[PDB]
Amino acid sequence: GSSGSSGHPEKCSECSYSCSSKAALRIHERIHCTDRPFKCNYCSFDTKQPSNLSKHMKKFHGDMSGPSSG
Ligand SMILES: [Zn+2]
Numbered sequence: 001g002s003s004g005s006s007g008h009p010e011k012c013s014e015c016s017y018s019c020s021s022k023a024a025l026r027i028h029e030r031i032h033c034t035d036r037p038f039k040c041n042y043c044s045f046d047t048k049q050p051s052n053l054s055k056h057m058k059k060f061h062g063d064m065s066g067p068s069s070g
């Protein structure tokens, strides 16, 4: 932890987000919400379509050294 910290009674495990009122924190957690089921493994790319992700895999992560064949 580079940046100092006051010492809030509650904090977020996902990010360095902390609040005074517990209930408040929970509300913040919402920030880590997602509507698109299909998510990428390489990057944080999420699409509400099965094809959008497929083509995206190669679109960006296509000319990469993944499989040990070729
Ligand atoms: Zn957070």
Ligand SMILES: [Zn+2]
Pocket: 040, 041, 042, 043, 044, 045, 056, 057, 060, 061
């Ligand atoms: Zn990706």
